[PDB]
Enzyme design. Structure first.
Site, PDB file in Angstrom:
ATOM      1  N   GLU A   6       0.828  -1.195   0.000  1.00  0.00           N
ATOM      2  CA  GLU A   6       0.000   0.000   0.000  1.00  0.00           C
ATOM      3  C   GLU A   6       0.868   1.253   0.000  1.00  0.00           C
ATOM      4  O   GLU A   6       1.887   1.317   0.691  1.00  0.00           O
ATOM      5  CB  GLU A   6      -0.953  -0.012   1.198  1.00  0.00           C
ATOM      6  CG  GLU A   6      -0.273   0.018   2.561  1.00  0.00           C
ATOM      7  CD  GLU A   6      -0.116   1.426   3.099  1.00  0.00           C
ATOM      8  OE1 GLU A   6      -0.677   2.360   2.485  1.00  0.00           O
ATOM      9  OE2 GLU A   6       0.560   1.600   4.135  1.00  0.00           O
ATOM     10  N   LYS A   7       0.474   2.236  -0.800  1.00  0.00           N
ATOM     11  CA  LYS A   7       1.174   3.447  -0.869  1.00  0.00           C
ATOM     12  C   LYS A   7       0.680   4.305   0.249  1.00  0.00           C
ATOM     13  O   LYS A   7      -0.428   4.835   0.180  1.00  0.00           O
ATOM     14  CB  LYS A   7       0.877   4.111  -2.218  1.00  0.00           C
ATOM     15  CG  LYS A   7       1.585   5.438  -2.569  1.00  0.00           C
ATOM     16  CD  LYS A   7       1.397   5.945  -3.969  1.00  0.00           C
ATOM     17  CE  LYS A   7       1.439   7.461  -4.190  1.00  0.00           C
ATOM     18  NZ  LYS A   7       0.933   8.343  -3.117  1.00  0.00           N
ATOM     19  N   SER A   8       1.493   4.455   1.288  1.00  0.00           N
ATOM     20  CA  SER A   8       1.043   5.112   2.510  1.00  0.00           C
ATOM     21  C   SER A   8       0.935   6.629   2.381  1.00  0.00           C
ATOM     22  O   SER A   8       1.755   7.274   1.727  1.00  0.00           O
ATOM     23  CB  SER A   8       1.966   4.753   3.677  1.00  0.00           C
ATOM     24  OG  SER A   8       2.306   3.379   3.663  1.00  0.00           O
TER      25      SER A   8
END
Length: 373
Positions: A67-69
């Site tokens: 996941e791209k935080s």
């Protein structure tokens, strides 16, 4: 309902103080010496926008996906204090090369019972995130997703396996050992450090349905990381960021225009035109598009009872490719520059829909196992 703005956004602040200019010069030089990079130039990698050609890329090579935080991308530097050589010091610095000095942080050395030894010439890549817990409990956290150097040795020439491997053993593992037996001490930490969990490249559906909705911090799409490539300073064509169209937002200047009828006075309760303008520079703005507002949406905007015209707004494209209001941006001097607008639109134009990304997964996985021979 108060008008939505950036004030609704959970803000992540680097838990430290800006390092002084003379200290920063030393740190830049020191980092450059170790890495072989240029002192004034950020050595961290930057991803490229996921496009159609990248479906084939994922098919040809081994990839991780996570996941791209939402948060702040920071490199972590373990060294000695530039003014006090006897003092261990930890720095977090961003792509603009803003260095922050972090205190009360501790990264144990393996098998040391004194707890006085410390790491130097160690450089991590990761993201500072803010996890939300019930009762307004907040926990700062540093998710590590790469290692550039550990204990004086540069690992940028190695692949991701060896890179994260050395970090896990020399840093995370001893930290895990310490934390398990020192919960009282741990609570003083400005943030907690952990290795960022990743999935195999063909496992995005698991992320969408199970991992992402259980996250305690903001999510901003997906990051694809190739496992057959060395660490690249700057733009890395192997490192891919994927975002749904609705997250590819643009900041515009909003203007309202009310139509004067043939007879009588203007009905200001009636739906006006919503003009979106783009910053051309200085004080020059030019027309770009109309913002699509439906009848019930217009009632909500009026219900805000705030000025609507001559304001910076954040907008997104819907399924029908119409610009939609998301929030006001009072934190901005101007709207996005035309160059930024074009760049964001290009990411969308070359983009891959979520559906098309998912339908490609079987092919990707199948080729993954046919490589595993």
């Amino acid at each position: 309902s108060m008008a939505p703005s950036e004030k609704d956004i959970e803000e992540v602040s680097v838990p430290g103080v800006l390092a002084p200019r003379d200290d920063v010069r030393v740190l830049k030089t020191r980092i450059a010496k170790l890495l072989g990079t240029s002192p004034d130039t950020f050595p961290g990698s930057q991803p490229v926008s996921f496009s159609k050609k990248h479906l084939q890329a994922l098919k040809e090579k081994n990839y991780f996906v996570c996941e791209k935080s939402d948060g702040i991308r920071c490199l972590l530097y373990m060294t000695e204090h530039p003014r006090y050589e006897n003092r261990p010091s930890v720095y977090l610095f961003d792509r603009k090369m803003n260095f922050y000095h972090v205190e009360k942080i501790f990264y144990p050395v393996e098998n040391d019972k004194s707890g006085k030894k410390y790491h130097v010439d160690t450089l991590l890549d990761g993201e500072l995130v803010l996890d939300i817990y019930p009762g307004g409990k907040k926990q700062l956290r540093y998710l590590v997703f790469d290692c550039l150097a550990c204990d004086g040795i540069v690992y940028m020439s190695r692949l991701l396996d060896k890179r994260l491997g050395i970090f896990a053993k020399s840093i995370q593992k001893p930290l895990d050992e310490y934390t398990k037996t020192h919960m009282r001490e741990t609570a003083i930490f400005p943030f907690l450090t952990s290795l960022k969990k990743m999935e195999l490249g063909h496992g995005i559906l698991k992320l969408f349905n199970e991992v992402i909705p259980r996250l305690r911090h903001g999510n901003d799409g997906l990051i694809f990381t190739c496992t057959e490539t060395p660490y690249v300073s700057g733009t890395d064509q192997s490192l891919l960021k994927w975002k749904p169209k609705e997250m590819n937002t643009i900041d515009f200047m909003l203007k309202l225009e009310f139509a004067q009828p043939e007879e009588g006075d203007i009905d200001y309760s009636a739906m006006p035109e919503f003009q979106l303008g783009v910053w051309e520079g200085r004080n020059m703005y030019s027309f770009f598009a109309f913002m699509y507002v439906d009848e019930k949406e217009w009632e909500k905007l009026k219900s805000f009872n705030v000025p609507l015209s001559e304001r910076i707004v954040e907008c997104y494209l819907d399924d029908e490719n119409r610009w939609r209001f998301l929030r006001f941006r009072d934190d901005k001097r101007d709207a996005n520059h035309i160059s930024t607008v074009k760049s964001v639109l290009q990411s969308i134009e070359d983009g891959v829909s979520k559906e098309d990304l998912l339908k490609e997964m079987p092919i990707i996985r199948e080729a993954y196992y046919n490589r595993k021979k």
